[PDB]
Structure 1
Amino acid sequence: ENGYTYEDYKNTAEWLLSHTKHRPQVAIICGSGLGGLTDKLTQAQIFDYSEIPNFPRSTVPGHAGRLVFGFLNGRACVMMQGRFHMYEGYPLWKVTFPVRVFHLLGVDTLVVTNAAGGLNPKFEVGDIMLIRDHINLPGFSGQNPLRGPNDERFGDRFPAMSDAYDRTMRQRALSTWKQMGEQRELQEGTYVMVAGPSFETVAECRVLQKLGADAVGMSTVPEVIVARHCGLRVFGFSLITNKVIMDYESLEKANHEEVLAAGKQAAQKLEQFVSILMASIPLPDKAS
């Protein structure tokens, strides 16, 4: 929790409320290369993290680190264009601040996306992996967003992540994929968070294999964790941007500077996939 008081979150959320007529239901966190989904909002109301009261400003992106509200396919959203990462220096309680605000804003669902490397060989760069589970490497060692005093107004001391990635929405995505009838099937697996800005080495790559990870990335888990702590329904995808080199040859590089995957049609399609799923995110009314 550290660094922010409960009322820090309340003041930010209230400030936001009194600044946008929008009252969101779905928060979407766009990963690298998937920031275009903001283009699909309507009645978009843009804010810089910096204009917003206690919001972590971005370390480099004075280019485009911002929060946009709007409606996407009949859903009252709010999207983070450019998320916070541990490797940039953000303590995990800053990286996830957004989520605690989203909850107070009235958000009841959080869809998170990220670009990940591929560990499972079945994966093809471009592949979109549905996140079924995660291996929280930093958390195993204290680097868990929930560290420090717990606020029962947000959740319990010991929340369970046994069930973080909403089951329902995974069926819906598996199917919505098919509805679209899109050739290659939407993948699904286990996402391993890993910090430090550098990329893996063949040997590290093989330990992540052993551990049972299908994709490796440097974000998402902190956000997923506090979403759950809050009671947010959570689901997310991972854009396989490269194949992590699991052998001592290959050369087929795994890369960000080589994030053309995330700057490709590949990214473009995850953007409409996420737009379609808006229709399948349950309304707060439930209804009938």
Structure 2
Amino acid sequence: SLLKKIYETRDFLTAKGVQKPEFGLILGSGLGELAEEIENALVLNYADIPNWGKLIYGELAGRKVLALQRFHYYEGSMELVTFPIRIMKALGCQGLIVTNAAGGIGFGPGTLMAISDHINLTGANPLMGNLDDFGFRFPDMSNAYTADYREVAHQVADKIGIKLDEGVYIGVSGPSYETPAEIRAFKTLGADAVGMSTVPEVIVAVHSGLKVLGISAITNYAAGFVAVTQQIKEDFKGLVKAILVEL
């Protein structure tokens, strides 16, 4: 069963040394280097973990984090994508900082975009269809991207001088990139950035009762539209640590 699997893995993790994580941290494509700065790190490889590419537990800005350096729906299962989020909850995390590499639609290269909301165009919902024992059939998604966290994110960014934009992320399955016409359609539907992750993790986070901060790093426009990537990367690492201090 799902819950039985959730326990086996939480116990293996706890015995390995995963004590009391406060935030889950999912590092997107190109954003993995911050895991190297986790102190007193416990490094466990994905293949080594039961029912489950590295897992890192340790200290970052002095916060205990369980960092993922991720599964995607396009690799083949919403269950494997979101199982890590269930584990974060089961180990006692209070929130999720989920990040990704996104194609720009409302924003160009260099943008760090904190996620205000999302659109699920993956064709799948990770809560389908067994979760009965959680007793939470119809999660409300109106504050999935915790307003309070986004407020903290902006306050920190404003203080320390890192530009932090804000907008809507549309999640699709991948793995092929979207065509120009698709991106035009997604703009019409209100999307500011697109990518192949995050939406399923966030839906599960909400069902889990987890608070969530979403951050998209935008290196490239999406289809139809020098280094920026070193700047992106430096800003990201600085902004994320500074946020963790007071999250």
TM-score by length of 1: 0.82
For residue 47 of structure 1, what is the aligned residue in structure 2? Answer: 44
Q: How big is each residue's C-alpha offset from its partner over 1:89-148, in whole Å with a ceiling of 9 and x where there is no partner?
A: 2x011111101011111111100000101111xx2201000100000012xx4x111001
For residue 220 of structure 1, what is the aligned residue in structure 2? Answer: 198
C-alpha deviation, 1:21, in angstroms: 5.2
Q: Secondary structure at the match of 1:31?
A: coil
For residue 15 of structure 1, what is the aligned residue in structure 2? Answer: 12
Q: Which amino acid aligns with 1:239?
A: A
Equivalences for residues 51-66 of structure 1 within 5 A:
51-55=48-52, 65-66=53-54
Equivalences for residues 248-287 of structure 1 within 5 A:
262=229, 264-281=230-247
C-alpha deviation, 1:152, in angstroms: 3.4
Give the stretch that moved more between structures: 12-21 or 65-74: 12-21
2:127 is aligned with 1:146: yes
Equivalences for residues 65-144 of structure 1 within 5 A:
65-81=53-69, 83-89=70-76, 91-120=77-106, 123-138=107-122, 141=123, 143-144=124-125
Q: Which amino acid aligns with 1:170?
A: R
For residue 216 of structure 2, what is the aligned residue in structure 1? Answer: 238
**What is the Cα-based RMSD across aligned positions, in Å?**
1.6
Q: How big is each residue's C-alpha offset from its partner over 1:24-58, in whole Å with a ceiling of 9 and x where there is no partner?
A: 11110000111011122111000011111111xxx
> Which blocks of at least 5 consecutive residues in structure 2 are unaligned?
none
2:180 is aligned with 1:196: no
Q: 2 CA distance for matches of 1:150 and 1:117?
A: 33
Tell me, yes or no, if the aligned pair for 2:43 and 2:57 is still in contact at 8 Å. Answer: yes
C-alpha deviation, 1:150, in angstroms: 2.0
1:33 to 1, 25, 30: 30
C-alpha deviation, 1:236, in angstroms: 1.2
Q: Secondary structure at the match of 2:191?
A: coil
Tell me, yes or no, if the aligned pair for 2:9 and 2:87 is still in contact at 8 Å. Answer: yes
For residue 58 of structure 1, what is the aligned residue in structure 2? Answer: none
Tell me, yes or no, if the aligned pair for 1:129 and 1:238 is still in contact at 8 Å. Answer: yes
Larger Rg: 1
Q: 2 CA distance for matches of 1:47 and 1:208?
A: 38
Q: Which amino acid aligns with 2:211?
A: R
Tell me, yes or no, if the aligned pair for 1:34 and 1:268 is still in contact at 8 Å. Answer: no
Q: 2 CA distance for matches of 1:50 and 1:146?
A: 25
C-alpha deviation, 1:265, in angstroms: 2.8
Q: Secondary structure at the match of 1:50?
A: helix
Q: 2 CA distance for matches of 1:21 and 1:66?
A: 14
Q: Which amino acid aligns with 2:12?
A: W
2:164 is aligned with 1:178: no
C-alpha deviation, 1:160, in angstroms: 1.3
Identity rate of aligned residues, in percent? 44
Q: How big is each residue's C-alpha offset from its partner over 1:143-194, in whole Å with a ceiling of 9 and x where there is no partner?
A: 11100132333x5011111110000111111110011023xx3100000001
Q: 1 CA distance for matches of 2:132 and 2:35?
A: 32
How many residues get paired?
247
